[model samples]
Target: LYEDPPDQKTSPSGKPATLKICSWNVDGLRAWIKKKGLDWVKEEAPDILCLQETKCSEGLSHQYWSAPYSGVGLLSRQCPLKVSYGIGDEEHDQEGRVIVAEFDSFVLVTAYVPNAGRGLVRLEYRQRWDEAFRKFLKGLASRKPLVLCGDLNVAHEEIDLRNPKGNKKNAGFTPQERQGFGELLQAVPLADSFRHLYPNTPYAYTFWTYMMNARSKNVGWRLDYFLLSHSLLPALCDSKIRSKALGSDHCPITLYLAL
Candidate 1:
């Protein structure tokens, strides 16, 4: 069921040459599944699936809960591979936001960054989280190649959103949040895989507000991402958005690595 597509070429070793990794901020695990999101996951069959904003914990008794993967029920049920969570800090871990997965060649991280609320109410805390997350990624990069992905909650550039001018002072489009995102990349030297491949591609968005018919109108922000370590750039085969997928405000993004 997880076999590579026919068009996918093999590596020098004559094995399936690519590893498909997917990341999505499902808004909430239970709601996503209620909309049959797992069915979509099965259709894609990503080798590694990293999900954020699960909003569920170990104590919950959802049907997906079981043995070792109990707490992270949504992913545990769908992935059938490996999974890990959080930045190893109690404060961040409490939210069920970050999840990591280990593969043969690299570590994949999925994060649901704390959003700076409307009017920039939480901007300072979001900045602090950005600093801590940057440090966490640096620590992981010290050991192995890493791919970080998720709804990072900030549009990195003007081109990343439809109305950058009007949204400048808003939560996700604020200058401080954008600069924080820039500093994370600068500190760790990671490349936004989608931007790396399509630097000037317009209207390629990932997250949409549930208001004003945003998704249908294509007036959205590219908040979700797949960022790869600079050393892993050569392994990058493709970075894509499953823009048509349904059940959440944020669509899923994938990264193909020729590992």
Candidate 2:
């Protein structure tokens, strides 16, 4: 029931120009479906979809907490050449926070990074996790053009959130986290595709609080991302947020690469 959008780009050879990859923190996979989540999926028909926070809390990664929480998954039109889980190093694959799907041309990695606690209890732990995650990403991208997407759990810049000042001490908005993400980008030189497309746009965000009707007010945080290796930047076609697709606290983000 889906056909290519009329505006889809075409290569000079008249071939399809882009492969669309999308990421979302659905909160709960099963409940989200009842709330019409798949509706957006059908309409968007992304070539690949990455999911985070599929907890039995409402739900869906690996580290496989004995409880149904904090997991990540990846889906694509065609099976990948290889799929791996965890930090993929030193028996760190316990929490299932990362998933890597390797294809012929590129590697797609999706993650739901650990969140710092409300009182910042886990802030330092998050920093440590961030360091390891960065190394993991660096290794993968070094092998191939890379597309990394997920609820990275940090807002990279002040413009990424509506109340950056008030939230500065908060988990996702903490300077430590923000700087950690900044350093990650500097190290990988990964491109945040959304920022590349809408550098100065305001109110462009991916996650909103379930508190104070934040979503309706557009008070949100840009915690989700589709970061790509420099080699893939030239092929970037579009990076966008499906803001109106309501089902969870976080909206879906999409990235298009002219593969």
Candidate 3:
């Protein structure tokens, strides 16, 4: 039950002092930045960047320890943001999938949720993960208003994917997975920032398959998101999908908060 505030397009300073938050599933950390994804990030100049599927290992250079943001040399020089990692568990920490950053206004969480797999083999585990994640977020929200963003891995509604009917039983579109997302929102006073602003917009997807010319055909799913506390709605300026900025299977989604 979130209500939209009156359309105040201008920020308090006359120009929007937007704190741009961006999220992307880099697919792999080293390769993406090397491919000049680093340059794109610097160009966007996001105040906080959340990357998923970083795929870092222990033996790798300490540079990877900066997570995705600081690892990209130029972006770090430009934004100079702080970084935190994982969900406070050894099992989850092993994958290098989560990163949280503290900015001036809010605590930002970037997560790469576990995929359910092709045959739904990981479905039950994913359900358990969702429950734990919901509780984890609840604790954070109690402390401060938060922005949770990343490859959430589920398309919550028919509008969220191009061919929802065909993919209903698939990993991300399964009824159980969607309901789990629903329950997470119910468990916390969070709102889907993009959908809140663009309710009926279609073909606004964050991820696409490499096979069958899916990206070219615009056949994709909105699996990435930026969910924020309802209390932060007034500071929200705009949310955008940078579909053209690409290197991996997914593109960048930006959240502009006028703080």
Candidate 4:
């Protein structure tokens, strides 16, 4: 069912064109809610927030945690009207990992792409996911402008990481993963909003493992992103990396759309 009178509200500036979205991995929603997570929502006030790695399964009770601003409606989490989880059937679904929301003007998809296991044990599966996932986003765009964001795990460009040469053989920087990312860009003209704003910028890392004092040293990888559909790229006004919000290892990414 559609939200009564619409879930959308006019901006404070009275502009009918601008929309804001914030994406974060949220790590685990269960723990996050215990630590000022819901407060962040009231403060940021994004028209839509695409969360990943919620790490929550279906049939879990959320009655104690539901807020006026948030709920588990999309696929299982709350969306304004409709929701789509991962493509195909439940067997293909991994936890409650991927969720989508179709809004008045655009479709937003959030996913926590699986990390290739140590020694790249899951690289083949990751590759297959990259293909199917790209196709899924393309299919959404066929209906409306789309915004895809999440902890994609792979850093697409060399500028996205600090030690590209040293990490070339690593899981997220492997040639196959990079190739998969390139193919996704080719399949759809979705623009990387952050890079589009800061072309060739360096040290713009997003995820840093808790080990080895990585975050403190700023040794990190740009594993998270906000992808704007080709048609909506022109409406993009601003994009940012919220490197300071530190409830999780992965910081939030933001985008502003001029409708």
The C-alpha TM-scores of every prediction are: 0.84, 0.89, 0.84, 0.82
lDDT leader? 2
> CA lDDT of each candidate?
0.75, 0.79, 0.75, 0.70
Pairs of residues clashing in candidate 3: none
Question: Worst ten-residue run, lDDT, model 4?
Answer: 60-69
The total number of steric clashes, by the backbone 3 Å criterion, in model 4 comes to 6
Q: After superposition, how far is residue 157 of candidate 2 from its true place, in Å?
A: 0.9
- Ranking of models by TM-score: 2, 3, 1, 4
- Residue-level lDDT tens digits of model 2 in 53-103: 877522011122211278776777877888877775554455657888889
> Which segments of model 1 are wrong by more than 4 Å?
1-17, 59-84
**For each predicted model, how many residue pairs clash, with residues at least 3 apart or on different chains?**
0, 8, 0, 6
Residue-level lDDT of model 1, residues 66-141, one tens digit each, is 1111123324223324565678776656555666665567777777788898778889888878888899998888
lDDT of 4 by residue, 1-259 (tens): 0011122223334445366677777777777778676677657667667676665644212121111112222221234456656655444364455777676778877777777768899998888788888887778888888888888889897888877998887889999999988888778768787787678577888888889998888888999988888777667666777776677778877767776
C-alpha root-mean-square deviation, candidate 3: 5.7
* RMSD to true structure for each model, in Å: 5.7, 4.9, 5.7, 7.8
Q: Backbone clash tally for model 2?
A: 8
